[PDB]
Structure 1
């Protein structure tokens, strides 16, 4: 329906991407999005070892014959992670596109480039997107304040961050954070982006491999039901508001709090159980304020189809109508 610099550059049907999703970004998710016409990604670090990732890629290929990418998130953790080996596994597997995120991606970007693997780098500021562009990425994903996950510390929403980035960048731009439907798509495109990336919206789909209680929580949640944890540590993350995030906020409020004082609460091992068991209070789980615009659970195929058709109608009916 839409042809943009994004669809042309990455060879996909729709200007819609399903970026990194720790714990959730497995074969079922990626295959559903790939089969739906969008740019899908398997979460590399969701797999416990480079070998596990190779196997997951194979499993995904059994569910879809269409190409998909892999997200490589650079954890600021101190516990050694065989990043180099994960990269090697991604390349050896024939992956043609990778979405990198985190600090100091340079080393990985260069390696991927040497092997003809395109790179999309998720950034939270214009200065970061520019540095990434100078490093040679194929596109930049501009994550705004609205996003689930790490929005950085500048607190600039997409309405301003996107045009600000479009004013300076040359490579294609992917808008990320706060998008869920055709209205968001058109807004993103008008602001200077060539596609939209979504996370929360994909949690609320039939194929997303998570407990039905989580999908129900997203539908029931309004736009004001998310918390920004670890702001006092300059490691801000937007998560679903629950007993855990609220407790983390209480701890930070007391002042003099360090990561060690919350490591047990924000634990990833604890958060992954939210998606598996469906207990939304077991731990911290990512969700964006965009949940307030979500109240259904379509199959990924119809979802993407409806988004582009809605966007098309907004242009040809609503907007052109105002001009007539």
Structure 2
């Protein structure tokens, strides 16, 4: 339906991407998005070891014959993280595209390029995207203030950040954060982007391998139900509002709050159970404010189909109509 710099550069049918999703980005999710015509990703760090990632990549290929990428998120944890070995695993497996995210991606980006692996780098500010462009990325994913996950500390929504980035970048641009339907796609394209990336919208799909109660919570939540935790630590993260996030905010509000004071609460182990058990209060889990626009649970195939079909109709019906 839509042909853009994104679809041509990455060889996918639709200008829609399913980026990094810790715990969630498993074979089932990626295959579904890949089979749906979009650019999918397996979460590298969701797999406990490089070897596990190799096994997951093979498992995903059993569910889809279409190409898919891998997300390599650069966690700030000072704990043993064999990124190099993970990269090696991703490369050896023949992955053609990788989505990097986090701080100082230089080292990894360069390596992937040396082996013919295209790199999409997700960043939260124009200055970061430029630095990445100078590093040689194939595309930049501009993540706005609306996004689930880490939006950085500038607090600039996509409506402004996107055109500000388009004003300076040359490589393809992927709008990320706050998108869920065709209206968002057109808006993103009009603002200078060539595709949209979504996370929360994919949680609310049939194939997303998470407990049904989590999918139900996204559907019930309005746009005002997310919290920004760890702002006082300059490690801001937008997560689903729950007893846990509210607690960490109370701790930060008290003053003199260190990571060790909340570590147990923001535990990834504790957060991974939300998805497997369905206990939305067990721990911290990522969700964007765009949840307020979501209230259904389609199969990925129809979702992507409907988004581009909705977008096309907005152009030829609504927009062209106003010009007629």
- One fold, TM greater than 0.5? yes
For each residue in 1:216-253, what CA deviation from the matched residue of structure 2 results, as whole angstroms up to 9, or x when unmatched? 00000000000000000000000000000000000000
Paired with 2:75 and 2:322, the residues of 1 have a C-alpha distance of 47
Q: Is the partner of 1:95 in helix, strand or coil?
A: coil
Q: Is the partner of 2:46 in helix, strand or coil?
A: coil
Q: Is the partner of 1:63 in helix, strand or coil?
A: coil
For each residue in 1:172-215, what CA deviation from the matched residue of structure 2 results, as whole angstroms up to 9, or x when unmatched? 00000000000000000000000000000000000000000000
Paired with 1:143 and 1:266, the residues of 2 have a C-alpha distance of 22
Aligned position for 1:53:
53
Q: Is the partner of 2:178 in helix, strand or coil?
A: coil
For each residue in 1:129-161, what CA deviation from the matched residue of structure 2 results, as whole angstroms up to 9, or x when unmatched? 000000000000000000000000000000000
Q: How does 1:224-239 map to 2 (within 5 A)?
A: 224-239=224-239
Moved >2 Å (runs of 4+): none
Paired with 1:111 and 1:156, the residues of 2 have a C-alpha distance of 31
Cα distance, 1:320 vs structure 2: 0.2
For each residue in 1:72-106, what CA deviation from the matched residue of structure 2 results, as whole angstroms up to 9, or x when unmatched? 00000010100000000000000000000000100
Are 2:319 and 1:319 aligned? yes
For each residue in 1:89-127, what CA deviation from the matched residue of structure 2 results, as whole angstroms up to 9, or x when unmatched? 000000000000000100000000000000000000000
Cα distance, 1:68 vs structure 2: 0.1
Aligned position for 2:33:
33
For each residue in 1:50-73, what CA deviation from the matched residue of structure 2 results, as whole angstroms up to 9, or x when unmatched? 000000000000000000000000
Q: Is the partner of 1:213 in helix, strand or coil?
A: helix
Aligned position for 2:163:
163
Paired with 1:201 and 1:128, the residues of 2 have a C-alpha distance of 26
Q: Is the partner of 1:142 in helix, strand or coil?
A: strand
Paired with 1:22 and 1:171, the residues of 2 have a C-alpha distance of 27
Pairwise CA RMSD: 0.2
Paired with 1:151 and 1:51, the residues of 2 have a C-alpha distance of 30
Paired with 2:113 and 2:277, the residues of 1 have a C-alpha distance of 39
Q: Is the partner of 1:262 in helix, strand or coil?
A: helix
Paired with 1:258 and 1:78, the residues of 2 have a C-alpha distance of 15
| Matched residue count | 324
For each residue in 1:287-320, what CA deviation from the matched residue of structure 2 results, as whole angstroms up to 9, or x when unmatched? 0000000000000000000000000000000000
For each residue in 1:17-46, what CA deviation from the matched residue of structure 2 results, as whole angstroms up to 9, or x when unmatched? 000000000000000000000000000000
- Listed as ranges, the gaps of 5+ residues in structure 2 are none
Paired with 1:124 and 1:255, the residues of 2 have a C-alpha distance of 27
